[PDB]
Amino acid sequence: MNYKLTLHPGSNPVEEFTSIPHGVTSLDLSLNNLYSISTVELIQAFANTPASVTSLNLSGNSLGFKNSDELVQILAAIPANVTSLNLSGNFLSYKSSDELVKTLAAIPFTITVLDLGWNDFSSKSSSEFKQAFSNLPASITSLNLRGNDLGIKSSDELIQILAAIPANVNSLNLRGNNLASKNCAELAKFLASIPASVTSLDLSANLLGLKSYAELAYIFSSIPNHVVSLNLCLNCLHGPSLENLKLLKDSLKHLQTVYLDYDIVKNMSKEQCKALGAAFPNIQKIILVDKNGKEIHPSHSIPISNLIRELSGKADVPSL
Known part of the structure; x- marks a missing residue:
C-alpha cells in the first residue's frame, strides 16, 4: 500500500516516520522541500522506516541544490528493503560531473529500479552522461529517463x-522526451x-x-x-x-x-x-x-x- 508522508518546515522527520503504519510498501516523500531538511534527522528517520517499504519516492525535492556530501549520505542511508527509488524532478543536472558521479554512486546496490526523470539531463553532453551513469550501481535493471528533453539532442x-x-539495464523508459x-x-x-x-x-x-x-x-x-x-x-x-x-x-x-x-x-x-x-x-x-x-x-x-x-x-x- 502507498503512504504519503507530508513534511513541514518545522517537522521532526524521526517523529513523523513513527506514524508510518507497518504494511506500507510504498513511501511517498515527494514535494517535501527535502533539500533543506536536516540531514542528520532524515538519516535517523530512515533508520526507523518500516521494513515493509520497498519503494521510495523522493521526487520534487530540489535535491540538486542540497549540499553534495549530505546528498550522498541521504542516499547511502536509504533502508536496505527499498528496491525502487524515484529521484525525478530534483534539478540533478545543476550538480557538476564530479558531484553527480558521487551522488549516483551513493545509490545502494539494493536498488534495481531507478527514476531519474525530469532532471534537465538534456543539458549534459554524451561525455557527461557517460561519466555520470558509469557510476550507477550495477544492480539497476530498470532506468527511467522520462521528461529530460532528449529530443533536443543532435542525433550523434x-x-x-x-x-x-x-549494460545491466534491461528496461529503458524514454517517455515524454519530444523524440518526434x-x-x-x-x-x-x-x-x-x-x-x-x-x-x-x-x-x-x-x-x-x-x-x-x-x-x-x-x-x-x-x-x-x-x-x-x-x-x-x-x-x-x-x-x-x-x-x-x-x-x-x-x-x-x-x-x-x-x-x-x-x-x-x-x-x-x-x-x-x-x-x-x-x-x-x-x-x-x-x-x-x-x-x-x-x-x-x-x-x-x-x-x-x-x-x-x-x-x-x-x-x-x-x-x-
Whole structure:
C-alpha cells in the first residue's frame, strides 16, 4: 500500500516516520522541500522506516541544490528493503560531473529500479552522461529517463548517450522526451542503436503521431530484434485509416508485448484492428491503457476482450 508522508518546515522527520503504519510498501516523500531538511534527522528517520517499504519516492525535492556530501549520505542511508527509488524532478543536472558521479554512486546496490526523470539531463553532453551513469550501481535493471528533453539532442549525441546506458539495464523508459522533434532518418538511427541489453522500451508521449505512417513504418522497423516489449501510448495517432495502418505491416514483428491506447483502438473497425495487429504478427500480450495510464484488465470488459482478440488475430469458432 502507498503512504504519503507530508513534511513541514518545522517537522521532526524521526517523529513523523513513527506514524508510518507497518504494511506500507510504498513511501511517498515527494514535494517535501527535502533539500533543506536536516540531514542528520532524515538519516535517523530512515533508520526507523518500516521494513515493509520497498519503494521510495523522493521526487520534487530540489535535491540538486542540497549540499553534495549530505546528498550522498541521504542516499547511502536509504533502508536496505527499498528496491525502487524515484529521484525525478530534483534539478540533478545543476550538480557538476564530479558531484553527480558521487551522488549516483551513493545509490545502494539494493536498488534495481531507478527514476531519474525530469532532471534537465538534456543539458549534459554524451561525455557527461557517460561519466555520470558509469557510476550507477550495477544492480539497476530498470532506468527511467522520462521528461529530460532528449529530443533536443543532435542525433550523434543521442546515439552516444544510448552508449552510456549501463549494460545491466534491461528496461529503458524514454517517455515524454519530444523524440518526434527529430526527423525520421535521425529517429530511426537512434532506435537502431538501442543497446543489446534493453528488451523493454517505453516510447510513450513522444509525439510520434506527428509523423507520417510511412515514416512510422521505417521508425518501427528500425527497433532492434532484442526489444520484445514496447510502450507506444500517448503518441497521438491520427486518422488510422485502413491504408495508413497497412503501411505498418510487419514493422514491429519482433514484439512480444505492446502497450496501446485504449482510446485509439476503441473506435477501430475489425479490419483496422486486424491491420494494426499486422504490424506485430508475433505479438503475445497486448495491453490497452486508459487515459490516465492505467492498464485495463481484459477479463472484466467484453469490448476490451473483443478488441484484443481482434488485434491479436486470434479466432473463435464462428469466425472460422
